[PDB]
């Protein structure tokens, strides 16, 4: 009953390992590993922000002979707005409730915010993915220094 998909030896993979949320802005390690002849080396990363990978997905849909490619779509921008606002009210209520109910709904909201972390990770890597898996795309000038240019590119 195994079913089962295989990977061998691929040529270009692309992940996001680790990533930094500091007052709710997301800093995102992108790590490449390559047995491709195009990049500078076999693995790197570099650091990115949210506004990066909305560059880059824009220089995509702006590039005329891309018109016939289906470009995918942008990860969303990330929102902590929600959890952030429940973490305020919580702290504000700490002495009109048990230290025992504080800490389990403080263990609980930071599941919360965790949980929206993850999703946009999700949602960027995915992204990332996706473009390493098209054959025009994933050779695109723009999308290699994306990946390889450890520098801030939005300064
Ligand atoms: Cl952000």
């Given at each position: 009953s195994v079913s089962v998909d295989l990977n061998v030896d691929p040529s270009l993979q692309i992940d996001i390992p680790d990533a930094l949320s500091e007052r709710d802005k997301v800093k995102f390690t992108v790590h490449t590993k390559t047995?491709?002849?195009?990049?500078?080396?076999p693995e790197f990363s570099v650091t990115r922000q949210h506004e990066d990978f909305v560059w880059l997905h824009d220089t995509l849909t702006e590039t005329?002979?891309?018109?016939?490619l289906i470009i995918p779509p942008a990860p969303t921008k990330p929102d902590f707005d929600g959890p952030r606002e429940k973490m305020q009210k919580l702290g504000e209520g700490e002495g009109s409730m048990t230290k025992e109910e504080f800490a389990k709904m403080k263990q609980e909201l930071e599941a919360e915010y965790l949980a929206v972390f993850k999703k946009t990770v999700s949602s960027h890597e995915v992204f990332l993915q996706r473009l390493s898996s098209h054959p025009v795309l994933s050779k695109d000038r723009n999308f290699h220094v994306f990946l390889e240019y450890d520098q801030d590119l939005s300064v």
């Open positions: 047995t491709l002849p195009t990049f500078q080396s005329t002979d891309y018109a016939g």
